[PDB]
């Protein structure tokens, strides 16, 4: 989203390790003090003046300073790479020792910075977790948590770089040695290099080309071209959507049966499906009988259980009307 903000804005146009140690010590003192102040507790104003004004500004500024020191070291690494590159242009075989020293000092400096960084990373993390623990002492300390969540990453991030840079540099270093072991070993006097340069400059005075095997490619049969189906389909376009309505007769019947049956639950009277169904089906014509029975059963089985079902004695098929309708259910006793 910041792109539009920038568009409307319309704007346009110290590597010493003793330092890092002293910022780390200052950070340790301030962080411990803030953590202890938070742990002691206080009112909203005390919480503010002890954990939001002192902590926030100081820790942000000094972590930014430490990051700035790391960036200055990055600049120094770049400068030493450039110095090595320029030196190898001027001495060739005689700069090998100079480059090895420069690599040695840079590696040692990087290792010492990593050591100084890890010299206080763990305890600072512990103090930050302590501040996290003490943060919950008030409900308005939400912002504190952000710092206690933010000031984490930076620190770890810093430490990460302290290793990552070395991981990069220890890599680059090797290449330089490889170069010395490969580029200059077979070109000790460099004469091959100048002669190649002049050949490039004056190549077309004797244009020559190398020979390479160019075996033939195995010609293959092209798969048949794919032809789609075209028929210009035509047909009647659909009319406006019609509509149909759902019959709620079964809903009315279910409401009737539930009202007629709730009395049994109210009085806890033993319900016998046989007699109830036989009585109730008489009120409807035969074709509807089934659609009644089902519904009634659906309403009846929600009301308690039948204790006889645990007796191991099967129930009989009681007739509930003429024409041959039957029902199998024990009396519903336990409501």
């Amino acid at each position: 989203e910041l792109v539009s903000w920038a568009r409307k804005n319309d704007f346009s146009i110290e590597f010493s390790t003793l330092r890092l140690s002293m910022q780390l010590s200052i950070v340790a003192n301030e962080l411990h003090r803030a953590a202890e102040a938070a742990e002691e507790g206080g009112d909203e104003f005390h919480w503010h003046r002890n954990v939001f004004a002192p902590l926030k500004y100081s820790v942000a500024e000094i972590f930014d300073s430490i990051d700035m020191s790391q960036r200055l070291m990055d600049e120094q690494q770049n400068f030493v790479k450039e110095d090595i590159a320029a030196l190898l242009n001027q001495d060739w075989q005689a700069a090998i020792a100079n480059c090895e020293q420069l690599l040695s000092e840079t590696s040692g400096t990087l290792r010492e910075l990593q050591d100084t960084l890890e010299a206080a990373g763990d305890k600072l993390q512990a103090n930050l977790l302590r501040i996290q623990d003490a943060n919950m002492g008030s409900g308005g300390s939400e912002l504190v948590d952000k710092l206690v969540f933010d000031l984490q990453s930076k620190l770890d991030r810093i430490i990460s770089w302290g290793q990552q840079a070395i991981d990069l540099w220890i890599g680059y270093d090797r290449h330089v040695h490889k170069f010395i072991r490969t580029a200059i070993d077979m070109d000790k006097n460099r004469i091959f290099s100048q002669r190649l340069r002049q050949s490039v400059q004056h190549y077309f005075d004797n244009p020559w080309t190398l020979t390479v095997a160019n075996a033939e490619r195995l010609l293959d049969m092209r798969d048949e071209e794919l032809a789609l189906r075209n028929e210009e389909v035509t047909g009647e376009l659909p009319l406006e959507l019609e509509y149909e309505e759902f019959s709620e007769i079964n809903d009315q019947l279910a409401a009737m049966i539930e009202k007629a049956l709730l009395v049994y639950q109210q009085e806890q009277r033993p319900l016998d499906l046989g007699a109830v169904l036989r009585d109730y089906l008489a009120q409807h014509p035969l074709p509807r009988h089934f659609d009644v029975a089902r519904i009634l059963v659906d309403q009846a089985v929600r009301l308690g259980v039948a204790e006889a079902d645990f007796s191991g004695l099967p129930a009989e098929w009681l007739a509930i009307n003429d024409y041959g309708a039957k029902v199998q259910a024990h009396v519903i006793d336990t409501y």
Binding site: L2, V3, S12, D74, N78, Q164
Partner: protein, 94 residues
């Protein structure tokens, strides 16, 4: 030191992502994406996205705004980091 609107916006986006980046490292694979997004927002196509992105990154590197490190495993085989001058220019507004 010469930051047109597009270059400045790309730098500000880089700074924001670095601030929200976990471990404070930026591979060029994300720098190219950021430049594509900023150029899309600014609605200008002088050349292809890739060529413009490459030219801007190189210009900032030589203008002392970014530092490049060759790491093959990294997405794009390079890792970029804001330089002190770039940090200052970015936080001057932020």
């Amino acid at each position: 030191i010469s930051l047109p609107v597009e270059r400045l916006a790309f730098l500000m986006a880089i700074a924001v992502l670095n601030s929200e980046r976990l471990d404070g490292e930026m591979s060029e694979g994300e720098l190219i994406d950021a430049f594509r997004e900023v150029c899309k927002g600014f609605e200008q196509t002088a050349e292809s996205v890739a060529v413009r992105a490459n030219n801007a990154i190189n210009d900032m590197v030589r203008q002392k705004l970014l530092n490049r490190f060759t790491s093959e495993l990294a997405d794009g085989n390079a890792i970029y980091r804001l330089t002190p001058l770039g940090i200052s220019i970015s936080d001057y507004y932020i």
